């Protein structure tokens, strides 16, 4: 911790390069337009919401950056990647309007987007695909997202894929937001990886929403203490220019002592009072500090301002950051929340128009008019001139990449479509599939395999040799080993998965990890990734409740597919065989990185269990993509059922089919369900459309074009809801679903599959019971199966075990 | 960052209080048994798994704590709260066996728990309720959980509820695990709250699972740097006692220097070579260093050990931690992963036996025998004596609290059961219910309201005047204000929700926050809370996709219920009315904290929208708790349907019922569904039971007892699956479900409810559609309803919008 004053003394401060007077004029119009946008919205009385106090506190910080630092996307790179603090969006909209990028109508449609000519409350690429870039309103994600984005830019340079040396990643953070663990939890990575292309800008207004961040402490010193300790370059922007003479003339050092000892709570109390109060309670603390302003008026004392509101102090900080190498920089900008808003914290607008000398008549002021600068005016000219010098306007977003990739054909995965020699797992199939992609000229080096420590568990260790591990194992290494850090790996994945948009350089990441620690652990990032239109693959390894058998409660995943189906643009699959994994990976590659450029990302659960991998049935490709296909039908003259399975449990459902046929004379149609969720969505879309077009030919759910009406049983390694979700669309009156509801526990696969009532025995009993209800076999046969199979009909429901 | 030597020089090192040689005899048996447990499991060839290398590196650290520090649960307090690193569990089981707390048959069932006499892979209270206390195997949750547990202990002392001053919270962490953002992201909280009852014990073996944490750096210095920066007391336990004469003998300071410049990777390299390669590639760096070991044998060099393996060095650290006040302490213990396992990390077993002088003869070694110390032996005597002086054995867990609470009756919530004069929301209902609880003598001071910054948004402000904010606004304050930190808040909620077990002191937490930032953001902690048998309330405020209308994509929650239903022991509700909220909160209170002591926690989504709140219908209580009740029946002669709604959307389904009756003569039964998830679980249980008891009369799902066969339509503020999950159990041929699938966006509630196709007009069209299909009405009237209601039949599916 250093003294509570500016890091950069005035004698080391560079001359300000812009026109302060003209800049303030434009900045005041932006402040005004932002407040008009939100006030106009609130007048509608539709609970639209919106904030003003935060942007008022950081407007000058953004202004200096827009006028002198921010590079826009250009022909060479995506420009500076700015993670705009979410709730200051009105200020960004206000500037964009001023630059003629948005119409008044749009501002008048702030927070009213459904009908198409409105603006989102916050940065949401999915809602405004040509405008916003990084979803930041869920606090804490921006900081860690920014760290891994800066690290990815370095990666692209080190790998010789793109020169990104001219890009800087700015993460605009709140001080209260720094309390989210995700906020400082990975700051150490920036020092490890020497991220001198990263600048954290923390708006230290000392307040969060309902009160001070740490009233009895000094948040700025806390921030400086931990960032410095983590090895970052810390630049404090504490006091404005009026304080300089004061600090210089004070030979006693008491003013510094006084600033050091005063806590946040008191500094906040001062700004809520007046000049006389500050003279008595702050300077009045010591005779020497009292003497420094004895000859000042109370009004002159009240003029003293925080550093984050002084363009000269701000510039000094951003320029210094720009020259700092070998590590990242954090700028702690001291501001006043609700700056210039008066008592507020219908003439409160009058106060604001007076305070910022806004050019709005006391006559028109009732109309909450927006201010624009006409073409040819000083303001208009300067505004655009500064932006053109920095390559244009930002934020801006390109929705599709321009180059054409020569993707592998499904035939290139031919080896995986044949029966496999040895028993292997779908995870081994995944690695084999990746190897096929790594032989493809067009995308081999665009692939970004990502792992969170665990590689050996996934048989990925065979790649540490072939393509190497990134380590600026050298800087040309291709694999990203992020350690025990799922959120960090997900942030690398996200940066890679959106490179097609931000850098017009499509990269195809495959992040494989323990499925349990996917959506459950980084779900807020998975949602944000959907918002950011990520295109990549999330491979949930060691998946299935009963399949990662020895690991237990906190590892046995029988529900990640329930979490993943809540993300609209995530496409999820639970393949049982190697050929399915290949057809799915190929399809995903084609949809996301082929000419379609579909904005979706994939989720594929894979397994750590080896078993026989048969050849793909001729023509089953499309059915695998759609979510289901008939594997075979076994004959039997005593009855007929339908049996569905997915993932590791399918082979057990097939075992049940053979038992039903040979022991009971019951034939069956056996289906592999590669994606219950895609089938459910398809069924939902068909019935929605049918409800809306009552006079037309009703659409038939895909699952109904595959299944028939005989009694059906489904079993998977996931909770029942995974397979039950398609009930409405299954065309049979009986559809029984077995699943792994309940907490996991350690045991053999055999014991867990019996415990969770999903093994072949339970599928047979479920099928026989349906026949028995139809009077096709004696109920005693079902009772006898239960006993023969050692099934305990009265053990507690696994959900409650 | 200090020199790469012990923080506590030998001159300030207290005399070790124990019998080193005897403790080693005991420790060697624990080491042996842990290994035997894992090897015997491996022999079964059931992919059970388990670890050995990690515990071998930290065994002595734990051993010193078990002999001289760890306080067991006693009559005064719950003892020290030890968050044992998850994968060192075999060592804990080995010691417990040696203490006679576990049997040999239990060790032989390591990782086979289904049949009842086994041991979980890791610390899972849900699976071993009388043994484990804290779920730590999901890395990163242990450290932040421990920080807030330590804070909660202080809270209990300041509130005057329990004297926890003698309790220390120990978090045993791995160095690789420190990369999890949750691991270091909340550490400044320990400094703000002066948590001198918290000790972080980081096993710095320089390795994670697939390689070194940071081979090109020095993870110990990185850790010291940031913890020191966060205000913690850092104690580095670097070198064993053999280095003391050496470090002192060096006058050039070349050794200190040599130690400072060597990177993690080099150090790991050395421990795989031998004294030879060490006296040359480490000591043979500077003539002054290689000269210190001039008169030394390559064997005496190879003898130099890391501090984490020397009990004298370990004791000093823990003793210094125990004495420290005003801040938390972190101990960085330098160890060797796979310590003493030689060759590897019957020949390897022979090596272990010899290396640690294990009392196992050549004749018995092939049987992989466990060792025990007979009563009367020195080892047995010492083992138990040390533990008795420390109040007993740990870990151990008490599943139920002993005191009897006098809970408020449902009558005490009478005002909430009546028709409300003022239009209010379910969130206002929750705050009022809390207030009722706050007037109950027995539980008023056991309630723990928790907020993450936002209180004003939730109308929680009126409570500050009543009970205040915990702020050591004073240390008697009842409300926990955790700032912008949902994970921290969840950890405080967990600490409070499990106080009933940990301190035999029931505390009832109510954590209210934006629902979107619940399971989605802290889902891994929620799962873990289930494992920890948490009994508390999670209130997802501002819930529903269309109800928090202006906030948009990262705020509009139409899926938290899909995430919460994956947790077995979480009970979820989405009430529409104030009376339902009171009935739900009363029942949860009774279930969890009444005599039943059910191990579940509640999740209730509440709304920010005000509307008319009717009186609870006579006798609806049981239906409200079970999940559904028939609100009303509307007469009609043209047809009849059933309409279901929950949350804020029920109001609209009720309006659709009026329209159906007024404009189309269609009558209906209207049901409020307070919990689609509890109904689906009930349905699954009935079907599971019916399948398992084919000779019995089929049980009928509650929802089917309540409903009839008339065409049904359901609408909610969540994705369709929320209501579709009960499809199988709805006894009607048609069950259409409207829901809010798709990303949220900003707009008026009216525009979003139309966009997401869940408003009254869509319910009416859905119902007419079913009647037309049945022939009751003409399809043409369905078509005319669509145009009449300004419904765009061809707009894109909201899931895709
Ligand atoms: C819906 O509007 P809101 O509640 O005002 C909003 C914008 O959603 C905010 S703003 C806010 C306080 C921000 O305080 P900071 O000091 O970080 O920023 P500022 O002082 O405003 O510059 C919080 C906690 N949240 C809520 C919040 C909480 N948790 C997460 C993960 N994200 C949030 N964004
Ligand atoms: C299946 O067992 P496993 O992989 O050996 C296990 C126990 O599951 C572990 S152990 C482990 C490495 C531990 O490294 P540390 O340096 O922290 O500890 P140690 O060196 O062993 O003392 C990881 C990443 N995981 C996996 C892991 C990853 N991510 C989370 C959130 N939790 C985990 N626990
Ligand atoms: Mg702030
Ligand atoms: Mg380690």
Distance (angstroms) between ligand 3 centre and the Cα of A469 equals 39
At residue A510, φ and ψ (nearest 5 deg) are: -130, 105
Angle at A41 between CA A35 and CA A43, to 5 degrees: 100
Cβ atoms of B387 and B99 within 8 Å: the answer is yes
Distance (angstroms) between ligand 1 centre and the Cα of A139 equals 7
- Encoding tokens for residue B549? 């209308």
Nearest ligand, measured from the Cα of A173? 1
| Partner A, chain B 350-389, Cβ-Cβ below 8 Å | none
Cα–Cα dist A360/A378, whole Å: 18
- Burial code (b: 16+ CB inside 10 Å, e: under 16) for B528-549 equals bbbbbbbbbbbbbbbbbbbbbb
- Regarding whether B690 and B768 lie in a shared domain, the answer is yes
Q: Kindly determine whether residue A453 and residue B48, on different chains, have CB atoms separated by under 8 Å.
A: no
Cβ atoms of A377 and A384 within 8 Å: the answer is no
Residue A583 three-state SS: helix
Distance (angstroms) between ligand 2 centre and the Cα of B138 equals 8
Work out whether strand B666-672 and strand A508-514 pair parallel, antiparallel, or are unpaired.
Answer: unpaired
Q: How many residues does chain A have?
A: 801
Confirm whether residue A205 is marked as ligand binding: yes
Cα–Cα dist A530/A569, whole Å: 6
Cα–Cα dist A523/B517, whole Å: 10
Q: Kindly determine whether residue A523 and residue B112, on different chains, have CB atoms separated by under 8 Å.
A: no
Cα–Cα dist A488/A511, whole Å: 11
Return the DSSP state at A296.
S
H or E stretch including B664? helix B650-664
H or E stretch including B561? helix B560-564
Identify the bridge partners of residue A629 per DSSP, sorted by sequence position. Answer: A672
H or E stretch including B788? helix B779-788
Taking CB atoms and an 8 Å cutoff, what residues of chain A touch B186? 181
C-alpha separations of B79 from A352, B76, B82, B390 in Å: 59, 8, 9, 9
Nearest ligand, measured from the Cα of A179? 1
At residue A737, φ and ψ (nearest 5 deg) are: -125, 125
Among residues B739, B727, B725, which one has the least CA distance to residue B544? B739
At residue A658, φ and ψ (nearest 5 deg) are: -65, -45
- Regarding whether A123 and A49 lie in a shared domain, the answer is yes
Cβ atoms of A479 and A469 within 8 Å: the answer is yes
- Regarding whether A482 and A464 lie in a shared domain, the answer is yes
Lookup result for tokens 């200051």:
A88
Cα–Cα dist A293/A309, whole Å: 21
Residues with CB under 5 A from ligand 4 (ion): B 174-176, 205, 207
Cα–Cα dist B322/B198, whole Å: 9
Q: Kindly determine whether residue B118 and residue A724, on different chains, have CB atoms separated by under 8 Å.
A: no
Domain boundary among B620, B647, B670: B620
Quote helix, strand, coil % in chain B, to nearest 5: 45, 10, 45
Cα–Cα dist A517/B553, whole Å: 24
In angstroms, what is the C-alpha Rg of chain B? 31
Among residues B529, B456, B467, which one has the least CA distance to residue B493? B529
Sheet of A570-573, strand order: A480-481, A447-451, A508-514, A537-541, A601-605, A570-573
Closest-CA residue in chain A for B559?
A566
Closest-CA residue in chain B for A174?
B484
CB atoms within 10 A of CB A350: 14
Nearest CA owner, ligand 1 atom 7 = A87
Q: With a 6 A CB cut-off, is A587 part of the ligand 1 pocket?
A: no
Cβ atoms of A724 and A730 within 8 Å: the answer is no
Lookup result for tokens 């937490």:
B509
Q: Which of B110, B120, B121, B563 is best to mutate for the A interface (most A CBs within 10 A)?
A: B121
| B86 CB-near residues (< 8 Å, 6+ apart) | B122, B123, B135, B136, B137, B139, B142
- Regarding whether A628 and A561 lie in a shared domain, the answer is no
- Encoding tokens for residue A767? 């099928």
Counting Cα atoms < 13 Å in the Cβ hemisphere of A578 gives: 28
Count of H-run helices and E-run strands, chain B: 34, 16
Distance (angstroms) between ligand 4 centre and the Cα of B206 equals 5
Distance (angstroms) between ligand 3 centre and the Cα of A175 equals 5
- Regarding whether B452 and B558 lie in a shared domain, the answer is yes
Lookup result for tokens 């600026």:
A472
- Regarding whether B413 and B378 lie in a shared domain, the answer is no
Cα–Cα dist A100/A90, whole Å: 15
Work out whether strand B570-573 and strand B629-634 pair parallel, antiparallel, or are unpaired.
Answer: unpaired
Q: Kindly determine whether residue A748 and residue B47, on different chains, have CB atoms separated by under 8 Å.
A: yes
Domain boundary among B558, B590, B620: B620
| B237 CB-near residues (< 8 Å, 6+ apart) | B6, B7, B307, B308, B313, B314, B316, B317, B331, B332, B333, B334
Q: Is B112 on the interface with A (CB under 8 A)?
A: yes
H or E stretch including B701? none
Q: Kindly determine whether residue A484 and residue B174, on different chains, have CB atoms separated by under 8 Å.
A: yes
Closest-CA residue in chain A for B731?
A733
- Encoding tokens for residue A39? 């006030």
> How buried is B24 (Cβ within 10 angstroms: 0-12 exposed, 13-18 middle, 19+ buried)?
middle
Cα–Cα dist A307/A632, whole Å: 74
Cβ atoms of A570 and A603 within 8 Å: the answer is yes
Q: Kindly determine whether residue B454 and residue A182, on different chains, have CB atoms separated by under 8 Å.
A: no
Q: How distant is the alpha carbon of residue B102 from its chain centre?
A: 26
Taking CB atoms and an 8 Å cutoff, what residues of chain B touch A794? 692
Query: Is the omega angle on the peptide bond into residue B395 within 30 degrees of 0, that is, cis?
Result: yes
Nearest Cβ partner for A126 among B126, B553, B720: B553
Nearest Cβ partner for B553 among A181, A531, A691: A531
Taking CB atoms and an 8 Å cutoff, what residues of chain B touch A720? 684
Q: How many residues does chain B have?
A: 801
Q: What is the DSSP string of A304-323?
A: --BGGG-HHHHHHHHHHHHH
Work out whether strand B639-645 and strand B601-605 pair parallel, antiparallel, or are unpaired.
Answer: unpaired
Among residues A393, A202, A168, which one has the least CA distance to residue A307? A202
Among residues A153, A192, A159, A162, which one has the least CA distance to residue A496? A153
- Regarding whether B356 and B207 lie in a shared domain, the answer is yes
Structure-derived torsion over alpha carbons of residues B533, B535, B537, B543, reported in degrees to the nearest 10: 30
| Domain, as residue range, for A707 | 621-801
Residue A472 three-state SS: coil
Work out whether strand A329-334 and strand A233-237 pair parallel, antiparallel, or are unpaired.
Answer: parallel
At residue A711, φ and ψ (nearest 5 deg) are: -50, 135
Work out whether strand A628-637 and strand A480-481 pair parallel, antiparallel, or are unpaired.
Answer: unpaired
- Burial code (b: 16+ CB inside 10 Å, e: under 16) for B742-768 equals bbbbbbbbebbbbbbbbbbbbbbbbbb
Taking CB atoms and an 8 Å cutoff, what residues of chain A touch B210? 451, 453-456, 461, 481
Residue B330 three-state SS: strand
Cβ atoms of B692 and A786 within 8 Å: the answer is yes
Cα–Cα dist B30/B256, whole Å: 35
- Encoding tokens for residue B178? 């420190």
- Encoding tokens for residue A527? 């949602």
C-alpha separations of B689 from A646, A781, B692, B731, B735 in Å: 24, 17, 5, 18, 24
Number of structural domains chain A divides into: 3
Cα–Cα dist B112/B115, whole Å: 7
H or E stretch including A236? strand A233-237
> How buried is A142 (Cβ within 10 angstroms: 0-12 exposed, 13-18 middle, 19+ buried)?
buried
Work out whether strand B169-174 and strand B81-83 pair parallel, antiparallel, or are unpaired.
Answer: parallel
Sheet of B712-715, strand order: B629-634, B666-672, B639-645, B712-715, B735-738
Distance (angstroms) between ligand 4 centre and the Cα of A382 equals 56
| A296 CB-near residues (< 8 Å, 6+ apart) | none
- Regarding whether A415 and A303 lie in a shared domain, the answer is no
Q: How far is A89 from chain B (nearest CA, A)?
A: 12
In angstroms, what is the C-alpha Rg of chain A? 31
Among residues A216, A143, A228, A150, which one has the least CA distance to residue A186? A143
Q: Kindly determine whether residue B554 and residue A120, on different chains, have CB atoms separated by under 8 Å.
A: no
Q: Is A2 on the interface with B (CB under 8 A)?
A: no
Cα–Cα dist A178/A613, whole Å: 50
Distance (angstroms) between ligand 4 centre and the Cα of B571 equals 38
- Regarding whether A151 and A170 lie in a shared domain, the answer is yes
Cβ atoms of A144 and A130 within 8 Å: the answer is no
Q: What is the DSSP string of B456-516?
A: GGGT-HHHHHHH-BB---BTT--BEE--S-HHHHHHHHHHHHTHHHHSS---EEEEEEEGG
Cβ atoms of A512 and A581 within 8 Å: the answer is no
CB atoms within 10 A of CB A387: 18
Domain boundary among A620, A637, A669: A620
Angle at B425 between CA B420 and CA B428, to 5 degrees: 90
Q: With a 6 A CB cut-off, is B552 part of the ligand 1 pocket?
A: no
Closest-CA residue in chain A for B743?
A568
Protein residues with CB under 6 Å of any ligand 2 atom = A 453-454, 457, 484, 486, 514, 517, 551; B 54, 87, 137-140, 174-177, 203, 205, 207-209, 337
Lookup result for tokens 């019922």:
B657
- Encoding tokens for residue A774? 């139809």
Q: How far is A681 from chain B (nearest CA, A)?
A: 9
Q: Is B196 on the interface with A (CB under 8 A)?
A: no
Cβ atoms of A365 and A359 within 8 Å: the answer is no
Instruction: Supply the CATH number for residue A281's domain.
Output: 3.40.50.970
CB atoms within 10 A of CB A698: 12
Cα–Cα dist A359/B621, whole Å: 62
Work out whether strand A628-637 and strand A666-673 pair parallel, antiparallel, or are unpaired.
Answer: antiparallel
Cα–Cα dist A276/A687, whole Å: 71
Cβ atoms of B676 and B707 within 8 Å: the answer is no
Lookup result for tokens 């109308």:
B459
Using CA of residue A496, residue A497, residue A498, residue A501, what is the dihedral sign? positive
- Regarding whether A272 and A380 lie in a shared domain, the answer is yes
Confirm whether residue A207 is marked as ligand binding: yes
Among residues B663, B661, B667, B660, which one has the least CA distance to residue B640? B667
H or E stretch including A371? none
Residue B309 three-state SS: helix
Instruction: Supply the CATH number for residue A649's domain.
Output: 3.40.50.920
Angle at B631 between CA B630 and CA B636, to 5 degrees: 90
- Regarding whether A476 and A447 lie in a shared domain, the answer is yes
Q: Is A562 on the interface with B (CB under 8 A)?
A: yes
Distance (angstroms) between ligand 2 centre and the Cα of A146 equals 26
Cα–Cα dist A329/A160, whole Å: 25
At residue A203, φ and ψ (nearest 5 deg) are: -80, 100
Q: DSSP H helical segments within B44-161, as ranges?
A: 53-68, 89-98, 104-107, 141-158
Nearest CA owner, ligand 1 atom 1 = B551
Closest-CA residue in chain A for B122?
A552
Nearest CA owner, ligand 2 atom 25 = B209
Return the DSSP state at B714.
E
Q: Kindly determine whether residue A568 and residue B216, on different chains, have CB atoms separated by under 8 Å.
A: no
| B569 CB-near residues (< 8 Å, 6+ apart) | A743, B126, B530, B533, B599, B600, B601
Q: Is A268 on the interface with B (CB under 8 A)?
A: no
Structure-derived torsion over alpha carbons of residues B150, B154, B157, B159, reported in degrees to the nearest 10: -120
Confirm whether residue B268 is marked as ligand binding: no
Cα–Cα dist B197/A102, whole Å: 56
| B325 CB-near residues (< 8 Å, 6+ apart) | B196
Lookup result for tokens 């309540």:
B706
Cα–Cα dist B191/B150, whole Å: 12
Cα–Cα dist B52/A570, whole Å: 39
End-to-end Cα distance, chain B = 53
Among residues A746, A557, A548, which one has the least CA distance to residue B93? A746
Nearest CA owner, ligand 1 atom 17 = A174
Q: Is A776 on the interface with B (CB under 8 A)?
A: no
In a mutational test of the pocket of ligand 1, which residue from B451, B483, B484 has the highest number of ligand atoms less than 8 Å from its CB?
Answer: B484
> How buried is B321 (Cβ within 10 angstroms: 0-12 exposed, 13-18 middle, 19+ buried)?
buried
Cβ atoms of A192 and A481 within 8 Å: the answer is no
Nearest Cβ partner for B121 among A746, A768, A797: A746
- Regarding whether A157 and A97 lie in a shared domain, the answer is yes
């Amino acid at each position: 911790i250093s003294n509570y004053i500016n890091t950069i003394p005035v004698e080391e401060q560079p001359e300000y390069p812009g026109n302060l007077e003209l800049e303030r004029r434009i900045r005041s119009a932006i402040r005004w337009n932002a407040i008009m946008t939100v006030l106009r919205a609130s007048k509608k009385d539709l609970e639209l919401g919106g904030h003003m106090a935060s942007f008022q506190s950081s407007a000058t910080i953004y202004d200096v950056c827009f006028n002198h630092f921010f590079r826009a996307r250009n022909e060479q790179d995506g420009g500076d990647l700015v993670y705009f603090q979410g709730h200051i969006s009105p200020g960004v909209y206000a500037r964009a309007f001023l630059e003629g990028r948005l119409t008044q109508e749009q501002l008048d449609n702030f927070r009213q987007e459904v009908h198409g000519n409105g603006l989102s409350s916050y940065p949401h690429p999915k809602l405004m695909p040509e405008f916003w870039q990084f979803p930041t309103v869920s606090m804490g994600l921006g900081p860690i997202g920014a760290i891994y984005q800066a690290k990815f830019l370095k990666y692209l340079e080190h790998r010789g894929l793109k020169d990104t040396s001219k890009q800087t990643v700015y993460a605009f953070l709140g001080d209260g937001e720094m309390d989210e663990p995700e906020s400082k939890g990975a700051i150490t990575i920036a020092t490890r990886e020497k991220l001198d292309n990263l600048v954290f800008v923390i708006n230290c207004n000392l307040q969060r929403l309902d009160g001070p961040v740490t009233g009895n402490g000094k948040i700025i010193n806390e921030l400086e203490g931990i960032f410095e300790g983590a090895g970052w370059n810390v630049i404090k922007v504490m006091w404005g220019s009026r304080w300089d003479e004061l600090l210089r003339k004070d030979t006693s050092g008491k003013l510094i002592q006084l600033m050091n000892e005063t806590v946040d709570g008191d500094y906040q109390t001062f700004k809520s009072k007046d000049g006389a109060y500050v003279r008595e309670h702050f300077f009045g603390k010591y005779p020497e500090t009292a003497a420094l302003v004895a000859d000042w008026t109370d009004e002159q004392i009240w003029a003293l301002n925080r550093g984050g509101h002084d363009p000269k102090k701000i510039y000094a900080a951003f320029k210094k950051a720009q020259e700092t190498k070998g590590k990242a920089t954090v700028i702690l900008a001291h501001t006043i929340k609700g700056y210039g808003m008066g008592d507020a914290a219908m003439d409160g607008v009058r106060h604001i128009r007076d305070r910022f000398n806004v050019p709005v008549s006391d006559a028109d002021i009732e109309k909450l008019p927006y201010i624009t600068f006409p073409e040819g005016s000083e303001e208009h000219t300067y505004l655009h001139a500064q932006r053109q010098k920095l390559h244009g306007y930002l934020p801006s977003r390109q929705p599709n990449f321009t180059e054409k990739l020569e993707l592998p054909s499904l035939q290139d995965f031919g080896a995986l479509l044949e029966e496999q020699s040895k028993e292997i797992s779908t995870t081994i199939a995944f690695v084999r599939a990746l190897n096929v992609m790594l032989k493809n000229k067009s995308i081999k080096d665009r692939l970004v395999p990502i792992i969170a420590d665990e590689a050996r568990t996934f048989g990925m260790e065979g790649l540490f040799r072939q393509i190497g591990i990134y380590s600026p194992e050298d800087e040309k290494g291709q694999i990203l080993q992020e350690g025990i850090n799922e959120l960090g790996a997900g942030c690398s994945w996200l940066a890679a998965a959106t490179s097609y948009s931000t850098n017009n350089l499509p990269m195809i990441p495959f992040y494989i990890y323990y499925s349990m620690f996917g959506f459950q652990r980084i779900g807020d990032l998975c949602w944000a990734a959907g918002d950011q239109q990520a295109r990549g693959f999330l491979i949930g390894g060691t998946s299935g409740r009963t399949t990662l058998n020895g690991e237990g409660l906190q590892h046995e995943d029988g529900h990640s597919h329930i979490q993943s189906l809540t993300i609209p643009n995530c496409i999820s699959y639970d393949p049982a065989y190697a050929y399915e994994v290949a057809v799915i990976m190929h399809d995903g590659l084609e949809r996301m990185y082929g000419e379609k450029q579909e904005n979706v990302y994939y989720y594929i659960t894979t397994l750590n269990e080896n078993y026989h991998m048969p050849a793909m049935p001729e023509g089953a490709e499309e059915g695998i993509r759609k979510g289901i296909y008939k594997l075979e039908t076994i004959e039997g003259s005593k009855g007929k059922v339908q049996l569905l399975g997915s993932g590791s449990i399918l082979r057990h459902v097939r075992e049940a089919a053979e038992i039903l046929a040979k022991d009971y004379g019951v034939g069956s149609d056996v289906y592999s369900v590669t994606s219950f969720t895609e089938l459910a969505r398809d069924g939902q879309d068909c019935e929605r459309w049918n409800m809306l077009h009552p006079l037309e030919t009703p659409r038939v759910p895909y699952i109904a074009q595959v299944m028939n009406d005989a009694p059906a049983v489904a079993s998977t390694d996931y909770m029942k809801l995974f397979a039950e979700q398609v009930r409405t669309y299954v065309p049979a009156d009986d559809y029984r679903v077995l699943g792994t509801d309940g907490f996991g526990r350690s045991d053999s696969r055999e014991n867990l599959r019996h415990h969770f009532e999903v093994d072949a025995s339970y599928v047979v009993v479920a099928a026989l019971g349906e026949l028995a209800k139809r009077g096709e076999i004696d109920k005693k046969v079902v009772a006898d199966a239960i006993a023969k199979f050692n099934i305990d009909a009265d053990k507690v429901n696994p959900r409650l075990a």
